[PDB]
Structures are given as structure tokens and as C-alpha cells.
Symmetry: C2
Subunit: 110 residues, 2 copies
């Protein structure tokens, strides 16, 4: 495993055993697909704040993070920022269903 | 104004005068740009659950909804669904900063 992948897996383990992280994560559901120099893995995020780390490619992810592994590691360690990094084009993102879901939620309320 | 645009403006007015809608909307911040057959307008969503409807094009929207106006009207009235509609390609969405923001939020917690 790349260091980034190893660390994502570690974060999932911490999340799944830590009630406080789960509370903070609760309320959102999605699958985040990673592709780091062709290394494929994903994290299923459940509304109860738990998650599942899986190998390979999920059939319909919420979005895919296509990032060089050394950059993503730096991000995971807080040496780079996903937002400014994205604004600079230091990685890319595929998929817009999350925006569709947001629009649906807003309109639902009226 | 298209009927869809008129209705979005009405929804913003209701949101801004209705404490309950504001409570339900609170906690998220973004600008949603609309482009409906070239008709341009946007809604600024603030974390306190209020909003601002504006004419024209905002310089850096969270995302842009590029939709035919009659379809979007049908969506706003609940005759079509933004999620299934998006899955079918009945409209499109430009921008992924919201995903970058989501990634940042998850990583922040570790």
C-alpha cells in the first residue's frame, strides 16, 4: 500500500472504534473512491458515522479523488490543504451527484 | 423571468422570513449559480440559514446548475427529481469545490 492508502485505512479504523468521531461524522452518507496513480480503493461513509474501507472500485461512487499519492499523503498529514490544493489543480475530482443531492435537499424543504 | 427563476426568487423570500426554514438550512454555506438557457442568476447560502438571490453571474460559485428552464420548473414543483434527473442527464452541474470542502472536513476531524 501507498502511505496515503495505509493512513486512510487507519483513519477508518479509528472512526469505527471512536464514538466521538462517529458523532461528528454522522448525518452524511456517501462513497468516496480513491485512485492514486491507479491504486484503487474506497471508503463507504454511513449516516450513523461509521465507515467501511474497501479495496478496488465501487460501482457508483459519490465522487472519485484522482490524486498523486505523495500529494495526498501530504494532505492527510496537514502539510497541504484539500481546498487550496483543489483550487490550484494539485489533484482532481470526478462526480457531481453530491450537488444533485444538495439541490434535492434544499427543494425538499419547500 | 422564467417561471423557474421567479419561483427560486420566491423560495429565497420565504427562506429569509421563516425562522424554521432557516434552522433547517443552517450549517451550510455556498453559492449556487443557475444558467437556464443563458438566463443567469445565483443564490448565496449563508451558514445562519438565510440567503440572497442575485441577478447575473457570481465570480466563483460552489457549483453551477445548467438546466433547461422547463425541466427545472418541473423539478421545483416536485414533478421531476434532481437526483434521478441528474442520473439521466436531464441537466448538468459544473464545479467540484464542495467535494474538496467535504474531504477537508473529514480529514480535519483526524
Amino acid at each position: 500500500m501507498s502511505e496515503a492508502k495505509e493512513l486512510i485505512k487507519k483513519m477508518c479504523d479509528l472512526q469505527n472504534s471512536n464514538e466521538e468521531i462517529q458523532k461528528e461524522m454522522a448525518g452524511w452518507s456517501g462513497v468516496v473512491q480513491y485512485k492514486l496513480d491507479g491504486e484503487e480503493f474506497y471508503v463507504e461513509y454511513k449516516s450513523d458515522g461509521t465507515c467501511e474501507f474497501k479495496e478496488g472500485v465501487h460501482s457508483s461512487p459519490t465522487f472519485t479523488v484522482v490524486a498523486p499519492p505523495d500529494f495526498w499523503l501530504a494532505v492527510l498529514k496537514g502539510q497541504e490543504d484539500p481546498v487550496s490544493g483543489f483550487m490550484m489543480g494539485k489533484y482532481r475530482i470526478e462526480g457531481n451527484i453530491m450537488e444533485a443531492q444538495r439541490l434535492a435537499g434544499v427543494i425538499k424543504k419547500f
